[PDB]
Design a protein around this nucleic acid. Structure first.
Ligand SMILES: Nc1ccn([C@H]2C[C@H](O)[C@@H](COP(=O)(O)OP(=O)(O)OP(=O)(O)O)O2)c(=O)n1
Ligand SMILES: [Mg+2]
Ligand SMILES: [Mg+2]
Length: 343
DNA sequence: GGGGAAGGATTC
DNA sequence: TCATGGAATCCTTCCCC
């Protein structure tokens, strides 16, 4: 057969805060990244469902949130803490399948093909899984089940929150036909608008255009991706993800183009980036700057060997110098990203 | 001879 | 200070050796 079971934790961060403070439950809760630039500068990382009903969701400014919802609990985000809960939950999942792809802090794919003989037993597995996370972590999750990762992902998107959905073989075929292509994982705002403009609305539409014409408009990779899902021939195996880069970006108190004013922030970011590397060694470093009008600009360097902390400090100042004498705009956010890990 | 670096798009 | 975090995947483009 080939059964994938996907698990996505409901309103994750905000839910961990309710579990930690069960008096929050049933009322609006908003998890915030406060940038420190003025009282309440920053964005919302997520909010529970009672906040979302009023428009308060992930990505908006805290300032927006607070004008639509004065009276909500606003909490700073403590990713560490959510990461500890996630790991315990990923270890429960591990118990239902050896073959598990941890996709992020709040979601994982299980290949349950050897555990379960059909979609009916998969569902029942969906449910002991749900009852088990609830019993052990007091966290509700949504489960999607289907023949591959993507449809398993779509199935969970359609059933959230606290849901479980199967998209069996006939349903795959219906969805390829009626599912708005904007709802396919990995297809964003810019790509969807490109596709509408050409009048491609459904996965099915992609089988009836010059592949070469699709590829032009959206890139070879997305074309191929969509077409393979539209042919029902998508079957990327469940695999261990290997982290490829680590980094840190911060917001300055104020916009500067002044190197001595910027460096305490760059060095702050190297030191936290280096600490999180823990034992792995990068051959590439990039300095990333977000300018006052929000363009992203970066300069990097790839060395034939690993970059020690001391080389990071001197390469990063140099790369900052290159940014500063290229672009004339002032800098609002500065950070560093290490990648191309040895071994 | 590509290849590497900068940016694009998406998602966390 | 004067909405627009932080983070990490591909992938694409385009310039120079
Ligand atoms: N712009 C964003 C979007 C999400 N997240 C974080 C907060 C979420 O708790 C977590 C997982 O994202 P989801 O899309 O799964 O959304 P939630 O889990 O919050 O809600 P739900 O899945 O219930 O829609 O990632 C973030 O930091 N920044
Ligand atoms: Mg998720
Ligand atoms: Mg979620």
């Amino acid at each position: 057969h080939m059964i994938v079971l996907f698990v996505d934790f409901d309103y994750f961060y905000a839910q961990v805060e309710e579990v930690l403070n069960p008096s929050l439950k049933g009322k609006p809760v908003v998890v915030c990244v406060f940038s420190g630039r003025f009282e309440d500068s920053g964005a919302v990382a997520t909010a529970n469902y009672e906040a979302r009903k009023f428009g308060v969701k992930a990505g908006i400014p805290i300032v927006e949130a607070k004008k639509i919802l004065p009276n909500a609990v606003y909490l700073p985000m403590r990713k560490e803490v959510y990461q500890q809960v996630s790991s315990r939950i990923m270890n429960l999942l591990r118990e239902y399948s050896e073959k598990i792809e941890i996709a992020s802090i709040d979601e994982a794919y299980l290949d349950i093909s050897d555990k379960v003989r059909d979609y009916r037993e998969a569902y029942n597995l969906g449910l002991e899984i749900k009852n088990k996370i609830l019993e052990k972590e007091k966290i509700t999750v949504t489960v999607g089940i289907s023949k591959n990762k993507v449809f398993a992902k779509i199935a969970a998107d359609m059933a959230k929150p606290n849901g479980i959905k199967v998209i069996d073989d006939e349903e795959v075929k219906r969805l390829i036909r009626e599912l708005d292509i904007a709802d396919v994982p990995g297809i964003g705002n810019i790509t969807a608008e490109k596709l509408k403009k050409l009048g491609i609305n459904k996965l099915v539409d992609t089988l009836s255009i010059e592949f070469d014409k699709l590829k032009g408009m959206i890139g070879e990779a997305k074309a191929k991706y969509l077409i393979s899902l539209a042919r029902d021939e998508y079957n990327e195996p469940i695999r261990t993800r290997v982290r490829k880069s680590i980094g840190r970006i911060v917001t300055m108190k104020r916009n500067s183009r002044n190197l001595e004013e910027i460096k305490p922030y760059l060095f702050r970011a190297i030191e936290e980036s280096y600490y999180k590397l823990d034992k792995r060694i990068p051959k590439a470093i990039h300095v990333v700057a977000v300018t006052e009008d929000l363009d992203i600009v970066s300069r990097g360097r790839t060395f034939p060997h690993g970059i020690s902390k001391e080389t990071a400090y001197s390469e990063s100042v140099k790369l900052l110098q290159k940014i500063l004498e290229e672009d004339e705009r002032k800098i609002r956010r500065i950070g560093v990203r290490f990648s191309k890990f040895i071994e």
